Structure formats: structure tokens, C-alpha cells
């Protein structure tokens, strides 16, 4: 990316340092009263929540570059008791206290806008995904998720668009009724599970059944959307 790298160098000019994490570590946790702004620069993470039993539920996955905040930018209070867990083997993240970012973001507007429109990408992402469910149910939800992963991670290959994610990573990505659905979707040759990776053969099928997540990605990341379209 371009604007993420310019946000990186802006943070480094002002003295914010990158921290490195390894799988399973928490960049922030739901018990820390200090709330943070994480500029995830490289790696894959996931937002989790722990219930009364103590089981972990995964709510959202984020790849670098992206911004994740544990608190409201002004109140500094929790937006939800959530943990940000690393799942990629290693991750690079800039951890900024919620207090300081307001002063950093004020000095430069273009980098404010950058954080602003990352929230917009998340808001619109959630609305798009709800929508595709409201139209096609879990078929729309699963095709939508496969379409995003294809766009972000695809490499065209003889067999299909390989979703070049790490074996361990895709396994945990995909309580097993969805896998059952996958075997149904597989039979109609939209996807093939080959070389220990998913290969998409009919992207148009996914786009037709998950249209608003396809629209979302086009409006939110047209350059990425353009390579496979």
C-alpha cells in the first residue's frame, strides 16, 4: 500500500516504534484499562471475546495494513471488551496510546482521514455482509467471505485462483455446519480443495450470489478489485 506506508513514516518521524508479535500473543486485551490504537502494519490478527464459560469467539479478522482501536478516540473508554490476537506466525504493529493519537492525528489531516476511512471501510463492510445474508442466507455469507479472501490473497494458477493463505491459517478460518455447506458448494465446482489450499474456478458464481460484498470491495479497494476483474 501507499497511504499506509506514509502513515508508517509519519508515525516514525514522530517517534512511534513498531512492536513485533508472534502467534497467540495479544496486542491488547479486554482487561487492560488503557485503551490503544493499533496500526497493524504487517501480519494477520483477530478480534476475540471471552464469554462466562471462557470460550473464545472470533468476531473479525484484520490484515496489515489496518487500524484497530480498543477505545473511542475521545472517551478513551472501551468500545467493547475485546482482545486483539496474532494468528500469523509473526506480526508487526505500532501500538499508540489513545491519548497521544488525538494529538498526532490533529497535526496532520491526511493521516487523520486515513484512520477515518478505515472505520468507514469497516462500517460499509458490515452493512454489505448483512445485506448479502439478507438476500442469500448462509450461501451469500460464505460466498462473500470466499470472494474477499480470493481478492486479497488470490494468485491465478492453472487450476484456479489459489487463496495463498498458510495451511494452519485457513484451517482455523474454516460448530461445523459451514464446512458441510462448503461440500455442497464444492460439488457444483465453484471451489476445489487442492494442494492444501482452496482454488476458485467460478468467481462469477461468487459475485452473483454475494453481490454487495463484491460492490463493497470495488468501492473500498478498487485497485485490488481490479486485478481479478
Amino acid at each position: 500500500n501507499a497511504q499506509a506506508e506514509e502513515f508508517k513514516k509519519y508515525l516514525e518521524t514522530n517517534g512511534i516504534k513498531p512492536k513485533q508479535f508472534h502467534k497467540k500473543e495479544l496486542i491488547f486485551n479486554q482487561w487492560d484499562p488503557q485503551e490503544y490504537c493499533i496500526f497493524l502494519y504487517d501480519g494477520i490478527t483477530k478480534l476475540t471475546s471471552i464469554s462466562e464459560n471462557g470460550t473464545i469467539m472470533n468476531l473479525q479478522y484484520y490484515k496489515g495494513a489496518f487500524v484497530i482501536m480498543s477505545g473511542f478516540i475521545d472517551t478513551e473508554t472501551s468500545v467493547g471488551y475485546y482482545n486483539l490476537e496474532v494468528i500469523s506466525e509473526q506480526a508487526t504493529a505500532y501500538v499508540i496510546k489513545i491519548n497521544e493519537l488525538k494529538e498526532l492525528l490533529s497535526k496532520n489531516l491526511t493521516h487523520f482521514f486515513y484512520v477515518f476511512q478505515t472505520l468507514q471501510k469497516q462500517v460499509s463492510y458490515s452493512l454489505a455482509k448483512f445485506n448479502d445474508f439478507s438476500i442469500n442466507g448462509k450461501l451469500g455469507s460464505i460466498c462473500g467471505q470466499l470472494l474477499i479472501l480470493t481478492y486479497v490473497y488470490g494468485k491465478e494458477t492453472p487450476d484456479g485462483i489459489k487463496i495463498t493463505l498458510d495451511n494452519l491459517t485457513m484451517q482455523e478460518l474454516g460448530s461445523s455446519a459451514v464446512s458441510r455447506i462448503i461440500s455442497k458448494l464444492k460439488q457444483e465446482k465453484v471451489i476445489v480443495y487442492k494442494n492444501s489450499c482452496f482454488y476458485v474456478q467460478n468467481l462469477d458464481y461468487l459475485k452473483r450470489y454475494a453481490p454487495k460484498l463484491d460492490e463493497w470491495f470495488y468501492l473500498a479497494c478498487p485497485a485490488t478489485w481490479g486485478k481479478l476483474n
Binding site: 473479525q60 484484520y62 490484515k63 471501510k121 463492510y125 467471505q145 474477499i148 479472501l149 486479497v152
Partner: peptide, 4 residues
Amino acid sequence: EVFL
């Protein structure tokens, strides 16, 4: 980016 965001996914799932």
C-alpha cells in the same frame, strides 16, 4: 484489509 478486513475479512471474515
